[PDB]
Structures are given as C-alpha cells and as structure tokens.
Amino acid sequence: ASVGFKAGVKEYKLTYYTPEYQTKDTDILAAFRVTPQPGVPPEEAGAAVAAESSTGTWTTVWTDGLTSLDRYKGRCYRIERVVGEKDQYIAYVAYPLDLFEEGSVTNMFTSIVGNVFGFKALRALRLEDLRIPPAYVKTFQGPPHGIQVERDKLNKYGRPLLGCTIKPKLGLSAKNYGRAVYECLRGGLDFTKDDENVNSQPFMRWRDRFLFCAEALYKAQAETGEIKGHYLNATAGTCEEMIKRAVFARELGVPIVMHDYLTGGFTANTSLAHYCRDNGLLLHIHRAMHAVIDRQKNHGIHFRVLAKALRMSGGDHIHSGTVVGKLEGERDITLGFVDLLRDDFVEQDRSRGIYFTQDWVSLPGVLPVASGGIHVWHMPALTEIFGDDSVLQFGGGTLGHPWGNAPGAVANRVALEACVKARNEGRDLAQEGNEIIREACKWSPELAAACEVWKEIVFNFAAV
Amino acid sequence: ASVGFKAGVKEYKLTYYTPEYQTKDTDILAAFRVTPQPGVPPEEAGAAVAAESSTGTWTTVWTDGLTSLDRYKGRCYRIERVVGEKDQYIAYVAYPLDLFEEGSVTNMFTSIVGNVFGFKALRALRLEDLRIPPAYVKTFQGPPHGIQVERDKLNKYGRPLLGCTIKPKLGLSAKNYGRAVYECLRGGLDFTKDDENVNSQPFMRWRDRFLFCAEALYKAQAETGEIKGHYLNATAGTCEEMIKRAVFARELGVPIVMHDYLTGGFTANTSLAHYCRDNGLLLHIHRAMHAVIDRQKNHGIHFRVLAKALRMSGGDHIHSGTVVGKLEGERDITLGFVDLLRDDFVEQDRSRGIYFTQDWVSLPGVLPVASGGIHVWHMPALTEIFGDDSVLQFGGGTLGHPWGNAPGAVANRVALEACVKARNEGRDLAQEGNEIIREACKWSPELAAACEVWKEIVFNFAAV
Amino acid sequence: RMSGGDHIHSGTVVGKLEGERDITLGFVDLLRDDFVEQDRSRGIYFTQDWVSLPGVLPVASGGIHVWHMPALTEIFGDDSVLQFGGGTLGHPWGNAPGAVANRVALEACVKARNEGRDLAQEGNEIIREACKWSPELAAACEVWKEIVFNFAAV
Amino acid sequence: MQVWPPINKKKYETLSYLPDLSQEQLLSEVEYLLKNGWVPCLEFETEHGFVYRENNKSPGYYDGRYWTMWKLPMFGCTDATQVLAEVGEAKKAYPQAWIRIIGFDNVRQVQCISFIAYKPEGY
Amino acid sequence: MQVWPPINKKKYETLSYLPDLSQEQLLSEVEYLLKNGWVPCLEFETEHGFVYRENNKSPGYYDGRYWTMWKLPMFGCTDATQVLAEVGEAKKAYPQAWIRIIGFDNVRQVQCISFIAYKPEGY
Ligand SMILES: O=C(O)[C@@](O)(COP(=O)(O)O)[C@H](O)[C@H](O)COP(=O)(O)O
Ligand SMILES: O=C(O)[C@@](O)(COP(=O)(O)O)[C@H](O)[C@H](O)COP(=O)(O)O
Ligand SMILES: O=C(O)[C@@](O)(COP(=O)(O)O)[C@H](O)[C@H](O)COP(=O)(O)O
Ligand SMILES: [Mg+2]
Ligand SMILES: [Mg+2]
C-alpha cells in the first residue's frame, strides 16, 4: 500500500522503466531485441515487455497495495539502439528470483515469454539471452550425467564420438532397423540412433525396434570390443508412455535413450532427465521444432537460450548445429553457445552473441552434436570447430556409401582418426584440411570409395 | 528395391514432387507457405520440405530398397504462387497415415515441423494449416469434456461464461489470492483463475493457494446460489509434479484445473487431459508462448494449427484471442479458427484462412476464451464476434474497478446480461452496441463506475 | 549397539585424534562383550548384560601407520578393523604397494604374537624386521618412521 | 566392393583404425599430451583385453574397463622420452600385457587422451 | 618403485602374505591354537580354490566358502603334532587339494583361526 488506489490506465513506463536499477546477483536478466510500433517510445515498449512479464496488467488494480511491487516487479533497466537497424533495440529486463518456481524451466518460460511476444504495441520481439543466476542454477538437476561421466562410462577419450541416424526416416521394419544398426556399428561408429520421428508406428513398434536394436548393438560390441550404444527414442504422447519405454531400455541394459525435448516439452523432458539420472541411462536431446522458434533475427527465441534451458532441464547431449552442412548456422554464434553448453563459466562476448556472463556453478556440461548433411570431406572442419568433446553424426553419410553401412562406418572412423592425428602431429585442420583426408583416402579403400562419392558436395548458401 | 542402388546426391524434386498425386482420404495434408532461397525452384524447396519431413535425407541410401517409399514418402503434390508476394508460395504436402503414432500430437509435430524450418535452401517456412483425417482424429481422446458436458455440469446456458485473472501477476500471498477470488466471484463472475505464470513460488505455494481458493469459491458459490469455479494452475516442472497438483484439486472437489500447454508440452498436456477425463475435472488451456511461434506471416506455425493440435491433445477451454484488445488478432482469421475449435465439420474457406475442410468426427469442441485488455465497453463486440459459447475474461477489468472486485464483477455481469437481452430483443450488437451498454450504465451503479473509468480506452494499432 | 551397526569407530589411542587406552578398553568391551562387569578403573559405572545382543566390531582409524601396527594389534585383538587412509594412499609407490605394506605389517605382527613374542615390548623389532624382508613394507617404514601424535590428552 | 571382415579386427578405441603407429608416430602422441599439460599415465592388462558384463548388466555397467596402473601417474615429468621408456619397461615383464597410455586433465578430471602403446602377440 | 603384479598372486587369507610357512612355523600355529582352547579342524577342497558366485549374487552370497571337512574336528586332542600328522595324511590322498587348518572357539562359535596348511602344485 501507500498512495491512494487511483483507478485507470497509466503508461507502463511509470513503473517498469527503471534505468536507475542496480541489478542483484540473484536477478534473472534478459536481453530482448524489441521493435516497437511506430508511435511507441522504446522505453514504453521496454516497460510493457517487463510489466506483462512479471507483475502487471493494462489498468490500475488496487491489490498491488497488498504486497509490494518494488520487490516483485520485473524491470526494464536499459534500452540500447541496434546499430544500423530499423527502429530495433535491446531492452534489458531484470527479474527477481522470488518470481520463479525452483527446478522449472516451464515456469521460467511461462513468465519471460508467456504473453509479451503478441503485444499489439510491438510488431516483433525476440529473446536473445538470459542470465541464469547461481541461486537459480543450483535448483536444477541438469544433465543426468554430462561430458566426463559419459566418457567415463563408455570408456572413450581423445576425439569426437561418432554416430549415424539410420535412414530412411520412417518405413523400415523392426528387424531391418536392427540389421542396419549392427551393420553401422561393427564398422566403427560409437552410436546409431532413431530418427527423431521414429516413435511407435504401424510400420515398426517401439518395443520391437528396441528388442532388435539391443540384439544388434550387443552383436556389434562383442565383435569390435568397443562399447557401443544405439539412441532408443522414448519420445511419446503421454508421460506414462514415455517413462514406460525408458523403463524397457533399462530392462535391456542398453546405455542411452533419446528424447525430442521441444515436441515432447520441458515438463516431460525434466521427468525423463530425472528418470535417467536414477537409472543410469545417458539421454540424447534432439531439438526438433526449434528452427520454428530460432530462425528469424527479429522475432522469437535464440537457440543459445533454448540451449541454456536444456542444460537446465536435463540432457547429456544436445544437437548444436554443423556450420558446414544441410541446415542453417553460423560459426561464431555456434561457438558461443557451444561454450554455453560445455563450460563452467563463460564470459560475456557480444562478438559471439553472448550478452551475459554465465556462471554454471558446476552444473555438468553437455556434449554438442554436429549432424545433418555432413560427409567425409567435412571431417577436419568439424574436428576443428568442435574439438574432441563433440558427437559427429553420419546419416546419409553412412548409409549413403557405395559399399553399404560397415564400410561407410569404417570410412568415417578413419577420416576422423586421420584428422585427429594430423591435429596431434601439429598439422592445421583449417589450412591443411583437404590434403589430410585426401591423403588418407589414398590408403583406405573404404575411405576412398567415400571421397569419390561426396567430393563435389557443399551446402554454401547465404545465411539467415 | 528394384533399380540399382546408385550412391550420391540427387534433387529432392525427383521423388517428392508429384503433382500427379491424388490424395487419399487418410493422408495428413499440410499447406506450407514457403519462401526459397534465390536459386531454389519452388518445386525443389517444396520437395525438400516433403522429404526431410517423412522418409528421406540428402544423399542416396540403399536401405530404401528394403521398404517401398511409394507407400511411405511424404509428397509435395502442388505449389501455388502467393499472389502479390515476394517469391513466396504455398507448397502442399501429403503424409500417409502409416507415418504417425496414434494419439500423439508430439509425433505429428516431430514429423511435420521437426527439421524443415531450418533448411539452408529456404529462407523462411511457415505451416498455415493441416488437414487431420478422421482415421487419425479417432485415435485421440480430445477434450476431457467439451462445450456440452461443461455447460451441463456447471448448469449454465444462454450467454458467454464470465471469468477474471487475479492480478498482480506474481506476488500475492495464498490468503490474499483467496480473498481476491471470493470477492470477484460473489460479484457474479463464473470463474476466477491463476495467471499462467502462478505455479508454486516463494511468495505463494501451490498447495496453500489451492486450499484457500477452495475456501473462497465455496463461500461465493453458497452466497450467490450459482456454481462457481477457480482455474487452479497444475503447470509444473515434471509430470509427477503436475499430476500431484491435479490430484489435490480432485481431493478438494473443485471443478476445474488449468495448464499452459505450450510451456508445459504436448506430452505433459495429454497426460493431464487423460487424468482430467478420468477424474472429471474440466481443463482450461493457456497458450503462453504461442506468439513466439505464430506471429510473423512468413515463418512459423499458424495458431489455427496450434488450435487444432490442442483439440486433439485435450482441453475444455483454449484462449482464442479478443480481436479488440491488448494483444494481436484479426477478426476473420479468428472467426476461422474459432470454428475449427468448436464445430464438427468446417468447410474450407480461404477467405478465413481455412485451407482444408476439417471433419472432426464428433471430437468434442472446445470453448474459446477471450482475454486480455478488454473492458465493459467491449462487451457488445465480444458478444457479437463470439456468441454464447465463449468465456470472456476480465483481469484488469475486474480488479481495476474503482469500488474493488465485487462491484467490478457485478459491472461485467450486468454489461453482458445487458448485451445478451439487447441481442435477444433483436437489437444489433454491432450498430447499436454503444447505446446498449451506455443505457445500462445509466441504471447500474457498479456498471456506471466502470463506464466512466474505461470510457476512452481502445487498443487500435495496425496489425501484423 | 542398540540402534544397529556392524562396525563402529572406537578410536586408535595412538593416532591423530583424542583417546586414552583404558577408557577405550572399557567401551570396546561394551561394544563386543556379552557381559561386562562394572570397573570404575576403566570408566564403566555399571555391569552391563547384553542378553545376547550381537556385538559390534570396533574400527581403528585416523593418522595410523605401519609403525603402529603392533600396538593396535596389541590394544585391539583380532576382532577389530584397522584403517589406513593416508597410511595407504600416502605410500611412495601408490595404493597397491601401500596395501601390501600394511598387510605384511599386520600379518607380521600376528605371527610374532602367535609365536609368543610380545607386541608391546618386542613391537618395534617385529615390524623393523619385516621392513627388512618386504620391499613395499620397507618403502613404508622409511617414510613414516619418525611420526607420532603424542600430545597431552583431554 | 569389399566385405569388412567380421573376424579378427578387435579395436582399441582412439587411433586403432589407422595403421600400426610407428615409434615416431607414437612419440608425437606423448608429445601432444605433454604439450597440453596432461599428466601421462600407464595401465596394462594381461587378462581381459575387452569389456565384459559378468557381474552386472544394469545400464552403464560393464566389467573390464578398469586396467592395472603401471607404477603411478608421472606427475611433473616433461620428458616425452621418459614415458616411452616406461612402455618398453613394461613390455619387458608383461610381454603378454596390452599396454596403454593415457592423459589426465586434473582440472576437468577427464582422461583427455588414450591410445594403445602395445598389444601383445596376435592382436 | 615396483609394480605389484596383477597375475599369479592368489591369496589365502591369514598369513598368506608372509613367506611360505616352514613346518616349524606351521607348528607354532597349531601350537597357538591349542594354547587357547580352540578345537582344531581340517578342511580340503579339490575343485574351487576360490569363491565364486554362480548360484546367486544377493548381498553376502558367495558360492565357494564351504570346503570338505577332513574327518571330524579333533575335539579333546592336545597333540599339536597329531594334527600336523593329519595334514601329511591328507596330502597323501588329496595331493591336488588345498588343505587348511581352522580353530573353533565353541563358546563364541567363531573360527578363531584359519591358515592354509598346503596348496597343491602351482599355487
Ligand atoms: O533427420 C535428420 O535430418 C538428421 O537426423 C540427420 O540425418 P542425415 O545425417 O542423413 O542428414 C539431422 O541432423 C538431425 O536429425 C537434424 O537436426 P539438427 O540441425 O538439429 O542436428
Ligand atoms: O495474463 C494476462 O495478461 C491475461 O491474464 C489477461 O489479464 P488481463 O485481463 O488483466 O489483461 C491474458 O488474457 C491472457 O493471460 C493473455 O493471453 P491470451 O491472448 O492468450 O488471451
Ligand atoms: O576422514 C578421516 O580423517 C578418517 O577418515 C581417517 O582418514 P586417515 O586414515 O587418512 O586419517 C578418520 O578415522 C575417521 O574418518 C576419523 O575418525 P575416527 O576418530 O572416529 O575414527
Ligand atoms: Mg533426426
Ligand atoms: Mg494470463
């Protein structure tokens, strides 16, 4: 209370534009890229985004006096012009800790991005980054396991982990799936996996696929003498269904399951991360639907946020993009968020799109996955851009090799070891790239067959 | 099989562009609005969209011969130029039934929108509509109850249902939340509800909120002699959490719960709808996050699809927009999806954005909710646009009344009953609107007070 | 011993943390014996009959090494667990060897005892002797030879 | 087109898909390790050349991952040559051992590297 | 610094870490046993020199603990030398047996002592 209740509308500006404000170390901060509507002062646009995101509505309600908005109000503490840009700004908003439910990305998302993106007063809105305070980070479980334990479990060090998505996407039988799996794995891939839309359909039922890929990976691991795994997709239509599948994988002794976190949802993911933690499965996150949110530079949510959100809710691996392949993605930005995915502390670096220093107070890091339209000739670049702490996946690039899967595997495994040694001997994957695999193509019949096939392919197209 | 395996890339066009195609009654069809990259022929764009959405990848894999893509391939059976538009088209794709897991919106979305929106070859992609076949509709539960049984249960006929979102957004104590609730409902509101972001927080914990709102709705119901309800937010961070809250609302005997389906997720929503169905709770859906996906006319998903997705997943109420208030929404489009939400069959009508005839084979219909920045002076319009089968909500519009909640409730009940009778006597809500409430303001003290306060407010701003 | 435990730490007398010999002897019997007669000498103010409750195995830990072997063995008897934290991962050739060191040290003490030597008087030669025949044991002896934790008790 | 054999191609993780590493080549490795700050360490196994699952099958459990430490991690060492020495030193004594070389990043606590330095006869 | 061998060092509990007990040495033992009131007993095993876990793996279950009693616990005996005898007696007849000597405290019911009196060839 204090100050009479005076009914009626007032600009947002009056309460949620606070340039005065001194951020608290426990505040959630957000960098929104706002583009107002013609007559809207940025500081009003900016104040609406903060109000309608925290404590306020469009008119004056007496109830405010029951509590104290100074404590609760979300607040726009600064605007910045987007240099060389169409009436577009960076409104910075700070959200007090007290506003968020502990352990819940769902909650956090409901607040920050709940309703503001549809304001009539704005024409476009996009969240670029969020500063998650340690006081909030400590309330999440985060990854079931993270980078070190994963390596430690599968016993695998020095070099990118290799994987392949069986294809065709849909239409293969429980049994063919197995066949294909075994064949890719014995070749020398570390993992094979279900395509993100392989759940349980009339052509192949989850329980059938799960039973045979278990048979197969077990065959391929005995054969090679190297721990193998096949990502078994637990994405389902109901949490009960979802857990039920994760439960079978556990019954089989297999090591990793997978889940489409955005089509599944944060509420369901969080549940699976907990289930994995307690049951010891590694969980692979697939980011289906994402580009629906993260493509346009003017409206939506940037992937670096989507990525943060996942290290929070739970996942051992997350698909981070390839720079160099079939889907969109620039190098600097990717580098930025990949550190957001694996490091303990990441210093703010506008160069790379990181608007805030992120301190993860030891939440496990997540292994980024490079996938989609990549082949043998990209090896040295991937290797370069990502480092050993990455998973590199060959779908088309494995089942696409002229002599079948086993060989297609062997090709990739050599391509990569090749690149890895070049690197270690001191070669320069960026300059010297091309000779290196070129060189190895010469000594490897399977590697060769590959080289010849995808030699001329690139996906150069001017990015969004 | 048949036709030698011939390794290497080939244009999508060769298999996913099939203008020949005669759509089967059981095919899922999707109208995508595609904007290619400069050198991309629409028919290639369109086929990339169909291949990378159903059965194929970027190069040739022998496994296709193991199955038969004629049966399974997703196929682009037609393109259309977007009259008076920047190299933008309507690619129309057809997905055979066999590809989707029964009952799972999760799976459907994973397929249709999984990866295509981030193709380098495209610069913008947007799903405008999806035709759900009766063979797939029948695999869904749909709403726990739907329009008829909800009216039947609450005993309410001939007029829009009235509701209010308690404000401030965040920051009120369990106790104060109840007080506010009792006060709003005794006034004449049918429902009050949790703000989509009120879950369980330091300032007010879910079980304390639920316990006091029950005490309060029970007080107001007894007082007025009319069934009351308070939407209790079950949105939580894990399914287990979610169910757990749903279970207490059941214990208290209260009639309706609520869930933010998009931040929650389809997996978790569906599980709640089931639980609600079996325990007879009505479910109110809050579409938080939706504008991140549905705003831009060139990229994303259109709400009519999000709307469809929910009638499948399960919801008794879904927010449909207001046209006339604080957030974006145009009248025709709106009328369009509102029919997609409530009617049994909805004839195609490009006028209104409906690209395909939708037959719901008796799936219950969902009550649209009109909310956000609406007041007394909008009554006649809303009534007009939406009719009896709607819920009209007054947040600010209720707690912002000069004489507090009770009177503000009364104000809206009278305004609405006012419009309803005008309508029934044959007046014309659209022409005669303004006098009607204006006339009422004259006889009702509480209504008056309201009229005077919001008289000058409107939210006219040129739409996106 | 009432609530439940198979092992309980009982102290070391001779190592890093506080504890006097008699008192210790006193409750060690309270932990393992069936009947324990009252002995104000040893701090036991009452006769304690456990009417067959099973007894617990006392554990000797914290700041103990190769050169304490004979005493511990002396003071505790076979029915005891003796623990080597630092005394094991503190050995110059790492853990295995360190293990081996303590094992020999202890089996060493055990036979001397059984041959009739006097762990208390003859202590010191006994391990000293064995350090001679055991490479791992020697490495040990050399490193912790001068260490003791004599400080006037509370 | 040729059938990747199904029979005597048991692997050893990193580098086992390139041709047998020459001592020079191998030297490059210990060199890299070093260059980076990893403490080099050695472990040899004379009986279970490959993972098994005899004691348990829960997810993640495999018997045979742990190997025997050869002496101790050579903290402070900077002579690439000295670790190589060790390899020699161990095939002498465990001619039938599989010997490997690993690199500890102590700040991250991860084995930043590992490559087999020596397979016994007929592997 | 030397690498404790990972291979032919199977133990046999108490005393197996000191050098092979001479008969004198062994005699001290049976002597001690007696000194105390323990009933000496003998048990030999010719097939499962070490614990296993074939029939079960619950906590505490190990197959391979029980061994065959050699005759009966020699109650009332006081001739250290007579038990020794027995030892001799059994290697005669079960040359391939592991033979062990134990001592029963009948008041506490605990084997107060146990030391192998004879490994077969090549152990
Ligand atoms: O289904 C696919 O298209 C892939 O499985 C790869 O198969 P290919 O390797 O044969 O193309 C994609 O990488 C991820 O699934 C795409 O996403 P992301 O950008 O999120 O990695
Ligand atoms: O939180 C709010 O702002 C409301 O609660 C309304 O409060 P007011 O009535 O006081 O504004 C909104 O209608 C819906 O929540 C907005 O979304 P939708 O467009 O999805 O209806
Ligand atoms: O943590 C420790 O210090 C120890 O673990 C010993 O480690 P070291 O053997 O390396 O000292 C201590 O015995 C008991 O834990 C101390 O207590 P207690 O008096 O009850 O036995
Ligand atoms: Mg995929
Ligand atoms: Mg709301």
DSSP letters spanning B133-154: -HHHHTT----SSHHHHHHHHH
Range of the domain at A454: 141-459
φ/ψ (deg, to 5) at C151: -160, 135
Q: Quick one: which of B11, B134, B36 has its CA closest to B86?
A: B36
Cα C93 to Cα A33: distance, rounded to the nearest angstrom:
60
User: What's the gap in Å between B368 CA and the centre of ligand 5?
Assistant: 15
Q: Are residues A225 and A364 in the same domain?
A: yes
Q: Return the CA Rg of chain D.
A: 15
Helix (H), strand (E) at residue B95: strand B89-95
Q: Are residues B226 and B351 in the same domain?
A: yes
Report whether B57 contacts A375 (CB < 8 A): no
Q: Check CB contact of D67 with chain E, cutoff 8 Å.
A: no
Q: Return the CA Rg of chain B.
A: 24
Cα A183 to Cα A271: distance, rounded to the nearest angstrom:
33
Cα C42 to Cα C48: distance, rounded to the nearest angstrom:
13
∠ CA A93-A96-A98, nearest 5°, is 150
Task: Give residues whose Cβ lies within 5 Å of ion ligand 5.
Answer: B 165, 195-196
**Which DSSP category does A376 fall into?**
G
Beta strands in A254-390 (DSSP E): 256-260, 282-286, 300-301, 317-319, 345-346, 358-359, 367-371
Report whether B304 contacts B353 (CB < 8 A): yes
Cα B355 to Cα B79: distance, rounded to the nearest angstrom:
13
What is the DSSP track for B183-225? Answer: HHHHHT-SEEE--TT-SSBTTB-HHHHHHHHHHHHHHHHHHHT
Question: Partners of A230 in the beta sheet?
Answer: A192
Work out whether strand B345-346 and strand B358-359 pair parallel, antiparallel, or are unpaired.
antiparallel
Peptide bond into B168 cis (omega under 30): yes
User: Is B165 marked within a binding site?
Assistant: yes
Q: Return the CA Rg of chain C.
A: 17
Helix (H), strand (E) at residue A165: strand A161-165
Q: Return the CA Rg of chain E.
A: 15
Which chain A residue lies closest to B175 (C-alpha atoms)? A66
> Can you give the residue ranges of every domain in chain D?
1-123
**Ligand 2 binding pocket mutation candidate from B189, B393, B399 (most atoms within 8 A of CB):** B393
Report whether B105 contacts B313 (CB < 8 A): yes
Cα A105 to Cα A331: distance, rounded to the nearest angstrom:
27
Q: Are residues A150 and A96 in the same domain?
A: no
Report whether B386 contacts B338 (CB < 8 A): yes
Report whether A371 contacts B56 (CB < 8 A): no
**Which DSSP category does A62 fall into?**
G
Question: Partners of C59 in the beta sheet?
Answer: C9, C81
Which of C111, C115, C137 best tests the E interface by mutation, with the highest count of E CBs <10 A?
A: C111
SS3 content of chain D, % helix, strand, coil (to 5): 20, 25, 55
Helices within chain D (DSSP H only): 23-36, 80-91
Nearest-CA distance from A413 to chain D in Å? 7
Q: Give the contacts of D69 (CB within 8 A, at least 6 positions apart).
A: C94, C96, D41, D42, D43
Q: Is the CB of A395 under 6 A from ligand 1?
A: yes
Nearest-CA distance from C95 to chain D in Å? 9
Work out whether strand D110-118 and strand D98-105 pair parallel, antiparallel, or are unpaired.
antiparallel
Question: Partners of B34 in the beta sheet?
Answer: B89, B125
**Burial state string for A181-218 with b = 16 or more CB within 10 A and e = fewer than 16:** bbbbbbbbbbbbbbbbbbbbbebbebeebbbbbbbbbb
Could you tell me the strand order of the sheet in which A75-81 lies?
Answer: A75-81, A89-95, A28-36, A122-131, A300-301
Report whether A46 contacts A63 (CB < 8 A): no
Cα A53 to Cα A249: distance, rounded to the nearest angstrom:
41
Report whether A396 contacts A373 (CB < 8 A): yes
CA E37 centroid distance within chain: 18
- Token pair in block for residue A451: 């080289």
Q: Three-state SS across B366-419?
A: CEEEEECCCCHHHHHHHHHHHCCCCEEECCHHHHCCCCCHHHHHHHHHHHHHHH
**Burial state string for B303-325 with b = 16 or more CB within 10 A and e = fewer than 16:** bbbbbbbbbbbbbbbbbbbbbbb
Residue A390 within a domain: yes
Cα B462 to Cα B306: distance, rounded to the nearest angstrom:
24
Cα A424 to Cα A419: distance, rounded to the nearest angstrom:
9
Q: Check CB contact of A92 with chain B, cutoff 8 Å.
A: no
Q: Quick one: which of B92, B108, B113 has its CA closest to B16?
A: B92
Burial (Cβ within 10 Å: 0-12, 13-18, ≥19) of residue E34: middle
- Token pair in block for residue A391: 């998973």
Q: Are residues A209 and A135 in the same domain?
A: no
Q: Are residues B254 and B363 in the same domain?
A: yes
Domain boundary among A93, A121, A140: A140
Report whether A437 contacts A451 (CB < 8 A): yes
- Token pair in block for residue A297: 């530079």
Q: Quick one: which of B125, B131, B127 has its CA closest to B42?
A: B125
Cα A114 to Cα A55: distance, rounded to the nearest angstrom:
13
Q: Are residues A93 and A58 in the same domain?
A: yes
Q: Are residues A64 and A146 in the same domain?
A: no
Report whether A223 contacts D5 (CB < 8 A): no
Query: Given phi > 0 = left and psi -120 to 50 = alpha, else beta, which region is B300?
Result: left
Residue with tokens 């993640």: D60
Residue nearest to atom 12 of ligand 1 (CA): A372
Residue A19 within a domain: yes
φ/ψ (deg, to 5) at B135: -75, -25
CA B313 centroid distance within chain: 11
Residue with tokens 């400069």: B38
Q: Quick one: which of D107, D103, D100, D34 has its CA closest to D67?
A: D100
Number of domains in chain A: 2
Cα B153 to Cα A433: distance, rounded to the nearest angstrom:
71
Q: Are residues B133 and B145 in the same domain?
A: no
Residue nearest to atom 13 of ligand 1 (CA): A372
Q: Give the contacts of E35 (CB within 8 A, at least 6 positions apart).
A: none
Q: How far is CA D111 from CA A152, D97, D114, in A?
A: 8, 21, 7
Cα B149 to Cα B174: distance, rounded to the nearest angstrom:
31
Residue A71 within a domain: yes
Cα B159 to Cα E45: distance, rounded to the nearest angstrom:
91
B215 three-class SS: helix
Residue B333 within a domain: yes
Q: Are residues A172 and A272 in the same domain?
A: yes
Ligand closest to A397 (CA) is 1
Q: Quick one: which of C15, C6, C8 has its CA closest to C65?
A: C15
Q: State the first-to-last Cα distance of chain A, in angstroms, to the nearest integer.
A: 49
∠ CA B360-B366-B367, nearest 5°, is 145
Peptide bond into A168 cis (omega under 30): yes
Residue A167 falls in the annotated catalytic set: yes
| CA neighbours closer than 13 Å in the CB half-sphere of residue E6 | 18
Report whether E101 contacts E29 (CB < 8 A): yes
Cα C146 to Cα B206: distance, rounded to the nearest angstrom:
64
Q: Is the CB of B61 under 6 A from ligand 1?
A: no
**Which DSSP category does A327 fall into?**
B
Report whether A449 contacts A407 (CB < 8 A): yes
Q: Give the contacts of B435 (CB within 8 A, at least 6 positions apart).
A: none
Among candidate residues A13, A153, A156, A167, the one labeled active-site is A167
Q: Give the contacts of E88 (CB within 8 A, at least 6 positions apart).
A: none
- Token pair in block for residue A375: 């082949």
φ/ψ (deg, to 5) at B203: -60, -25
Q: Are residues A200 and A287 in the same domain?
A: yes
How many beta carbons lie within 10 A of that of residue A389, not counting itself?
22
Residue type, B102: E
Cα B379 to Cα B447: distance, rounded to the nearest angstrom:
12
- Token pair in block for residue A96: 């007090």
Q: What's the CATH architecture for D1-123? A: 2-Layer Sandwich (3.30)
Cα B392 to Cα A170: distance, rounded to the nearest angstrom:
44
∠ CA B107-B247-B265, nearest 5°, is 25
Q: Quick one: which of C56, C99, C73, C100 has its CA closest to C14?
A: C73
Cα A234 to Cα A215: distance, rounded to the nearest angstrom:
18
- Token pair in block for residue A54: 């925290």
Q: How far is CA E16 from CA A10, A461, E19, E36, in A?
A: 89, 74, 7, 22
- Token pair in block for residue A89: 């700004």
C85 three-class SS: coil
Q: How far is CA B88 from CA A84, A291, B332, in A?
A: 27, 19, 22
Identify the CATH number of the domain in which residue A446 sits: 3.20.20.110
Residue type, C139: A
Report whether C118 contacts D93 (CB < 8 A): no
Residue A2 within a domain: no
What is the DSSP track for B267-285? Answer: HHHHHHHHHHHHHT-EEEE
Helix (H), strand (E) at residue A278: helix A266-279
φ/ψ (deg, to 5) at A437: -75, -40
Report whether A290 contacts A309 (CB < 8 A): no
Beta strands in chain C (DSSP E): 7-9, 35-36, 48-49, 57-61, 81-83
- Token pair in block for residue C36: 């324990």
Cα E59 to Cα E55: distance, rounded to the nearest angstrom:
13
Work out whether strand A300-301 and strand A122-131 pair parallel, antiparallel, or are unpaired.
parallel
User: Is B435 marked within a binding site?
Assistant: no
**Which DSSP category does C44 fall into?**
B
**Ligand 2 binding pocket mutation candidate from B162, B165, B166, B284 (most atoms within 8 A of CB):** B165
Question: Partners of A424 in the beta sheet?
Answer: none
Q: Three-state SS across E20-73?
A: CCCHHHHHHHHHHHHHHCCEEEEEEECCCCCCECCCCCCCCCCECCCCEECCCC
User: Is B442 marked within a binding site?
Assistant: no
Residue nearest to atom 9 of ligand 3 (CA): C85
How many beta carbons lie within 10 A of that of residue D30, not counting itself?
25
- Cβ contact, residue pair E29, C114, below 8 Å: yes
Domain boundary among B140, B175, B204: B140
φ/ψ (deg, to 5) at A102: -70, 150
Residue with tokens 């809207």: A40
Count of residues in chain A: 464
Residue nearest to atom 4 of ligand 1 (CA): A372
Work out whether strand B256-260 and strand B229-233 pair parallel, antiparallel, or are unpaired.
parallel
Residue with tokens 């099973």: C54
Q: Give the contacts of A312 (CB within 8 A, at least 6 positions apart).
A: A105, A132, A137, A140, A142, A363
Helix (H), strand (E) at residue B300: strand B300-301
Residue B195 within a domain: yes
Report whether D44 contacts D68 (CB < 8 A): yes
Burial (Cβ within 10 Å: 0-12, 13-18, ≥19) of residue C81: middle
Cα A59 to Cα A6: distance, rounded to the nearest angstrom:
10
Experimental approach taken: X-ray
Q: Return the CA Rg of chain A.
A: 24
Q: Quick one: which of C42, E14, E56, A272 has its CA closest to B240?
A: A272
Which of E1, E3, E56, E57 best tests the D interface by mutation, with the highest count of D CBs <10 A?
A: E3
Q: Which long-range contacts (CB under 8 A, 24 or more apart) does A337-340 make?
A: A337/A303, A337/A304, A337/A307, A338/A368, A338/A386, A340/A304, A340/A307, A340/A308, A340/A311
Query: Given phi > 0 = left and psi -120 to 50 = alpha, else beta, which region is B438?
Result: alpha
**Which DSSP category does C54 fall into?**
P
Q: Are residues B102 and B172 in the same domain?
A: no
Report whether E28 contacts E93 (CB < 8 A): no
**Which DSSP category does D59 fall into?**
T
| CA neighbours closer than 13 Å in the CB half-sphere of residue A420 | 28
Residue A7 within a domain: no
Work out whether strand A345-346 and strand A358-359 pair parallel, antiparallel, or are unpaired.
antiparallel
| Whether B and D touch (3+ CB pairs < 8 Å), yes or no | no
CA B45 centroid distance within chain: 30
Residue A464 within a domain: no
Q: Are residues B136 and B168 in the same domain?
A: no
Residue type, D123: Y
**Ligand 3 binding pocket mutation candidate from C61, C83, C95 (most atoms within 8 A of CB):** C61
Which chain A residue lies closest to D27 (C-alpha atoms)? A425
Nearest-CA distance from D67 to chain C in Å? 13
Q: How far is CA B392 from CA B256, B320, B325, B326, B415, in A?
A: 16, 10, 12, 14, 12
Residue with tokens 């969240």: A127
Q: Give the contacts of C150 (CB within 8 A, at least 6 positions apart).
A: none
Residue type, C61: S
Beta strands in B96-207 (DSSP E): 122-131, 161-165, 191-193
User: What's the gap in Å between B449 CA and the centre of ligand 5?
Assistant: 25
Cα B391 to Cα B48: distance, rounded to the nearest angstrom:
42
Domain boundary among B89, B116, B140: B140
Q: Quick one: which of A367, A380, A409 has its CA closest to A164?
A: A409
Cα D52 to Cα A447: distance, rounded to the nearest angstrom:
30
How many beta carbons lie within 10 A of that of residue A137, not counting itself?
18
